[PDB]
Amino acid sequence: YAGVAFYIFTHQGSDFGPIFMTIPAF
């Protein structure tokens, strides 16, 4: 949330979009 909010995740389910499931954790 906050910084790690809607902007990231490539706006999808926090996995398959933001390259891979590391970036969406940040």
Binding site: what residues are annotated? Answer: 12
Annotated binding site for Zn(2+): 12
Q: How far, CA to CA in Å, does 14 sit from each of 2, 3, 26?
A: 15, 14, 11
Contacts by residues 4-8 (CB-CB < 8 Å, ≥ 24 positions apart):
none
